[PDB]
């Protein structure tokens, strides 16, 4: 089971450096090169570099000066570091592995790391219930308000409740902080039997909040 | 660097139809093209390698062809789960580069929204802010209007909307409209209402509550 797991998302100050760790499993770093790709609003998908099986590195031309890739074979970790970040370096950064040890056919990807380059401060969210008040179907949710930066993950009942769940895209408020809501529709006759909890995780602030949502 | 041009920019089709994505390279690259699918909140997913070669675990309805400068990704019968963006990648020429992508949208029958309104929780009012939420659930097409009214006064500029991507199962959208007031203003009024206009509704639908009950 080939897998690539990246370190969590975070905020980086302008002109500061970015650090991401990629921990691989299901294969050895001595047999496969690990590539680094990012995905930004400005330039879409963009190949950044690679560290090969023997330890050599290649960097895409515009990153020759501020890119650095290292690894620890025994600990199965690949270390990505980029210097002098600016606002338009805000992007999702992936590690990837090709199908063969020498190719660029990216068959396996890390889950991605949203990197936000901003001078602002990290702020955890507040979570407020959207309490159910048609046709036997009740709607309820959670208001995840006033956090920075993106992202925030929301599940329901620790992943056991997935059907009918809508987690809306975050929107930027005038305060410079994000907000979103996550809703779910359920049978109204289960409100007195089942418990409904939204599990909010804002990894950038290490904020983990479980919010029970009840009829008011 | 090789420039990859993907056309069209947006593809809109109905379930069951064949659909073709185009990727044109700025110069001949042989058959050194790879295709990727990206679903909402996902990482890229490899579909086809080297113009036409299959990938383990990819449904057989995906296929590719082309050589030189013109390449094509095909879905012989699109399903609702194919709703995604699709990218090509060339690696005949260092460095490897990606096209800008084609968005695949799915048509379906008109579906009216189900509307719900949520007053601000007592917990939030302790912070001095009131968020009123209007939910439009599982509708098609995407276009919809939400009009807020506080004691019959039309609200403008003090709300924000967020729309989900197309659902992978029923191809519908859902929309949240959040009206944000101060606690002082919220306590000064009684009737809070969102009016929803949509093609699937013969008349605008209004959900409202009275502060208190």
């Amino acid at each position: 089971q080939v897998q690539l797991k990246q370190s969590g998302p975070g905020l980086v100050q302008p002109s500061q450096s970015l650090s991401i760790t990629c921990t691989v499993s299901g294969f050895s770093l001595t047999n496969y090169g690990v590539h680094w790709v990012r995905q930004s609003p400005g330039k879409g998908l963009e190949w950044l570099g690679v560290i090969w099986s023997g330890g050599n590195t290649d960097y895409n031309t515009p990153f020759t000066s501020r890119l650095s890739i290292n690894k620890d074979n025994s600990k199965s970790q690949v270390f990505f570091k980029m210097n002098s970040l600016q606002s338009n370096d805000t992007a999702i950064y992936y590690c990837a592995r090709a199908l063969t040890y020498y190719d660029y056919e990216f068959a396996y990807w890390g889950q991605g790391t949203l990197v936000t380059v901003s001078a602002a401060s990290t702020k955890g969210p507040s979570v407020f219930p959207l309490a159910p008040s048609s046709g036997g179907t009740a709607a309820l949710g959670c208001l995840v308000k006033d956090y920075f930066p993106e992202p925030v993950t929301v599940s329901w009942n620790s992943g056991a409740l997935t059907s009918g769940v809508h987690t809306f895209p975050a929107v930027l408020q005038s305060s410079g902080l994000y907000s979103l809501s996550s809703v779910v529709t359920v049978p109204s006759s289960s409100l007195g039997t089942q418990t409904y909890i939204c599990n909010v995780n804002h990894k950038p602030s290490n904020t983990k909040v479980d919010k029970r949502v009840e009829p008011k | 660097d090789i420039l990859l041009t993907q056309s069209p920019v947006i593809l809109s089709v109905s379930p069951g139809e064949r659909v073709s994505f185009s990727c044109r390279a700025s110069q001949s690259i042989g058959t050194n093209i790879h295709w990727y699918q990206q679903r909402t909140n996902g990482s890229p997913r490899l579909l086809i390698k080297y113009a036409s070669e299959s990938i383990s675990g990819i449904p057989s309805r995906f296929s590719g062809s082309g050589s030189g400068t013109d390449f094509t990704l095909s879905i012989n019968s699109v399903e609702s789960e194919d709703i995604a963006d699709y990218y090509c990648q060339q690696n005949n020429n260092w460095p490897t580069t990606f096209g800008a992508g084609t968005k695949l949208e799915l048509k379906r029958t008109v579906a009216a929204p189900s509307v719900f309104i949520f007053p601000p929780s007592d917990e939030q009012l302790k912070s001095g802010t009131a968020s009123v939420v209007c939910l439009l659930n599982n509708f098609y097409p995407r276009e919809a209007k939400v009009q807020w009214k506080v004691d019959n006064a039309l609200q403008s500029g003090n709300s924000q909307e967020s729309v989900t991507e197309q659902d992978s199962k029923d191809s519908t959208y859902s929309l949240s409209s959040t009206l944000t007031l101060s606690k002082a203003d919220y306590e000064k009024h009684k009737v809070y209402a969102c009016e929803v206009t949509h093609q699937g509704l013969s008349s605008p639908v209004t959900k409202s509550f009275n502060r208190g009950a």
Partner: peptide, 12 residues
């Protein structure tokens, strides 16, 4: 279209 890093989808 432009890539939106909140949804990882092209927003047009």
């Amino acid at each position: 279209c432009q890539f939106d890093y909140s949804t990882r989808r092209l927003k047009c």
